[model samples]
Target chain A: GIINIQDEINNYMKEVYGATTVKSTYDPSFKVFNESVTPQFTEIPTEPVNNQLTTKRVDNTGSYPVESTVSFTWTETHTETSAVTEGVKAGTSISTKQSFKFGFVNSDVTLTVSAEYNYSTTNTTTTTETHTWSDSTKVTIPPKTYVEAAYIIQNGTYNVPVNVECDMSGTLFCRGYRDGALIAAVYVSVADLADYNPNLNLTNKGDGIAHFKGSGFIEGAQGLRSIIQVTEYPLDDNKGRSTPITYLINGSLAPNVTL
Target chain B: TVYNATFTINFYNEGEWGGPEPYGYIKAYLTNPDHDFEIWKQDDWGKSTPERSTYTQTIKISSDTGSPINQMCFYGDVKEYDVGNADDILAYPSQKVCSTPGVTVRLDGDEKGSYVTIKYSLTPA
Candidate 1:
């Protein structure tokens, strides 16, 4: 659950970009600094891949719902296409290239969230590393990059991960297999996977990313006999944050592979 | 609580083939006269990133406008013509570790760092 820290950060951004302010409230308590929002959209043609396009006109209005956590819900909106058919997996092969539209509504959380961050630090670690060697070693480590949970939010909404609307074309293998058996798989474009989570982060660190697997996997490997993979071709990479934070459980159940 | 004084922040621009000198990040540290070569014992999880592509499409194609950035970041170079841009971004205080006790304030370009002086209390003899 991530509140959009952008708005508060925006006000902090004012001092440099807008009217210069030596806004200093010497006390460690509270105060408001001058605020601003930068106009003049970053000029580009056809919107750089995934660089949030102006499908609804680029209104330089800094109107994001602050104090709101990231979230979304998934709903299938496209089932009829000339090159594709549904009654299949939501984001899979037979349904490849099938048009699907997602509906998103973020709650207005700006006025709801309080901006009081009362920070306090307690000396919580011991430096006396006694040399002990039984299942333990002195865990001498480097400096840390950490974030603490100040508080949790009460906002509730299904944060849909992404929305893929297209038509399935070309006969491609679509199934996820496990132990020499077809598990689950789909061959489609990349844009389909992006619409799943329009809020969470997915880093695109290169050209030509070929990652298309199932959009939503409620229970990874439970009573199911195999794995599921949903693949798609990316029309663009203006990716979104993940709705449900994914933590993959590693290691195989019973693994003894001999060639 | 800072060294209550504002320096004009005048610095030399040693650039090659001068063309509106580029801007990234700059720093000033309080050196202790006692520790000569100890470089201000910065005990924080701080980092310096590579120079960013200052072009407009370079950044837009790179990432979102205000995405979570590292500390000490300067954005939108004049080449983008949005000279009004460019400023420090993210700043989280440095994390203290076992051997090093670094205190870094998150970079909010607008606010200056405040270094409070700890007063010592003496016991009566």
Candidate 2:
């Protein structure tokens, strides 16, 4: 009979105090700052340049060094090829090679040569003369090294984080717990320190933190747990001061109290 | 009926780095230069357990008028425990503690008419 009576009381209490709605959400309150995004189609400049061709002397035979090779291009049209080396001593000498097309013949075989004498000169000597045909074309090219330029062709995107601004506020409830049961709860209101006076302070460090000196016990029972409940309110209040503040319960935990 | 200022306790977990909240707890104390530490907890019993990676708790401390208000700060502890020891007793304020950039409280009116706007973000502590 008593069990039924207690159950009736519990129902009544639940009907009166039961929350109509329990909301839960997370808002860290730190506003993201300086967000930037950039997209690019061209290749970025890396440590070294790209898509470039370089050359170095591979078969230079002379006591003096060949500063550079003259830029010359030859087109092959015939099966015959010839190579000749001229000596001009201190001045200059031109070694020439030629190929002629009978009618409409094209090939990638081209003979390129530099000056025979070691001298500073620009690439201006070029000729397109007809020549006889042979089984194999023995063309003479300048003894130099060659390398292709480097480059990358790709698309990329960028997004970065710069700083953050924290502007947050919420409502907290300090609750009492015992043996896995909620005993009592109080709104964890901010402390007023304007007139605070206590002898329990150990440090003179005057930072703006509320220090509650008095201790209160909802029950004298041992192993009582002190817990705090946090409910974050919406950041946008459109109705001005009269707007209904909506809070989402996001965090709950036990305090360091042992009583 | 006087007031000092309102403060917010912004609790943050390392998120993915903090793993599941199977066993984790944190406590903090709002320290006043003239009074004992007012304690707060963010643990399993506060209302619910740590399900997400972040949390928050706001507190409003009531103050008296013409009282000698002092500088204030915060100190607290955080720990990760084993599930088996969930009910094991934990010292309220452990030896390990972290502090926040504190603020000073000054009041003009009573707790009913006066409100001081100040916020303190307690990262881990």
Candidate 3:
């Protein structure tokens, strides 16, 4: 399935964080700044967030009718009979000779009859037949769900205003504060931060954080910046304060602060 | 229009016997509106007891009036031969009308102890 990453991110923000406002910017030279004080910056370990879409295949379970053809061959016998009558000579011929009386006198007698004969002729015929009918067999196809882009996340927590930046030679500059006062600053490379979460959009040159800059920072500062105050969940009972954000430099913990 | 009808016998049961399995065979035929008892075909007797349970036969029928042949009737009988007496009628002669394809007909013996199942289909030649 095809999906719009930005749209999915917006939906995730609304459903999970109750975010009412959503904005995205695609500018290669985008940057964030803070003018209050140029607090020393440090690299912080960060994890990339992701959203996925999936779809299930339709169910195909039923019996289907199939048309079939078959041929049968059988032999049939036919008989023909005819009566033939012909003249036939029967009985033995008798000849009597009386030689004592006068000289020799011979007499002959013969019998004839007509006889009927029956003749029969037999023949065999082979016949082949074909027929068609429907037959049904049960079929089943199990349910199936497919994942797209090999990015499948289940029951994951997401934060809104996903500030992203690219084209940072290789580092991420982060600033932390408390009560509107700068507290800590760190710098880390994009590669080091990706180790924590590789799903973040860190390679797109046109993608970057927007409307996150504040006073005291240079207009076009290089690298990326993350405002812990806006990107992290707030602590319970601490309405105005957010949970402390931990910054990792080269896989090691840096100074952490809550804003 | 010529149409071919085929009947496939998938299963047959003749109940239980005391001494040995029963020897069985089937006699089946097809009929149409234009002709009655037109094509008759049956399977040969089995070699041993527990006679063959599966059989297939096809019959061709056509219409002389040039009308479409939409339906056909099938008749079947299952019997078991006995040594000293007449063949045992495992399943009495039964008839079924198949107006469409993929029709199955099941018949039970006269004594209700045996039955046979057959699947059939009819199509154009």
* Candidate of highest lDDT: 3
Model 3 docking grade: incorrect
The residue ranges of model 2 lying beyond 4 angstroms of the native Cα positions read: A1-259, B12-39, B42-48, B52-54, B62-70, B83-125
Tens digit of lDDT per residue, candidate 1, span A55-114?
111111122321212121122111110111111121122222111222112111111100
What are the runs in model 1 whose C-alpha is more than 4 Å off?
A1-213, A216-259, B1-25, B28-106, B110-125
Residue by residue across A94-203, what tens digits does model 3's lDDT show?
11111111100111111111111211111112223332211222222211211111111111111111111112222333343445454434443333333433344323
Q: TM-scores of all models? A: 0.13, 0.20, 0.26
lDDT of 2 at A92: 18
Q: Could you tell me how far off, in angstroms, the CA of residue A36 lies in candidate 2 after the best superposition?
A: 22
Tell me how far the alpha carbon of residue B73 in candidate 2 is from the true structure, in angstroms, after superposition: 3.3
Tens digit of per-residue lDDT, candidate 2, span A15-122: 434523222221232121121111121121211100101111123233333333223122222221111111111111222222111110111111222222111122
Tell me the DockQ of each model, to 2 decimals. Answer: 0.03, 0.01, 0.01
The interface RMSD for candidate 2 is: 29.6
Worst 10 residues of 1 chain B by lDDT: B95-104
Separate clash counts for every candidate: 54, 30, 29
lDDT of 3 at A250: 14
Positional deviation of residue A128's Cα in model 3 after best superposition, in angstroms: 48
